[PDB]
Amino acid sequence: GSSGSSGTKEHPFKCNECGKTFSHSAHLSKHQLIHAGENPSGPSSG
Numbered sequence: 001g002s003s004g005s006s007g008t009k010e011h012p013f014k015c016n017e018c019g020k021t022f023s024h025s026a027h028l029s030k031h032q033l034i035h036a037g038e039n040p041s042g043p044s045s046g
């Protein structure tokens with residue numbers, strides 16, 4: 001058949017923390033640092 005029913009979001013890199021997608025890894029890896037607390041909280045509320 002085919003690997004990827006959906007049309008868009010066909011990037012080889014997909015974040016598992018949120019569910020994002022990046023064409024290149026460098027982008028993902030970098031976008032991952034955001035999940036590892038890399039900014040001062042504020043308006044956040046759990």
Ligand SMILES: [Zn+2]
Binds near residue numbers: 017031
């Ligand atoms: Zn993410």
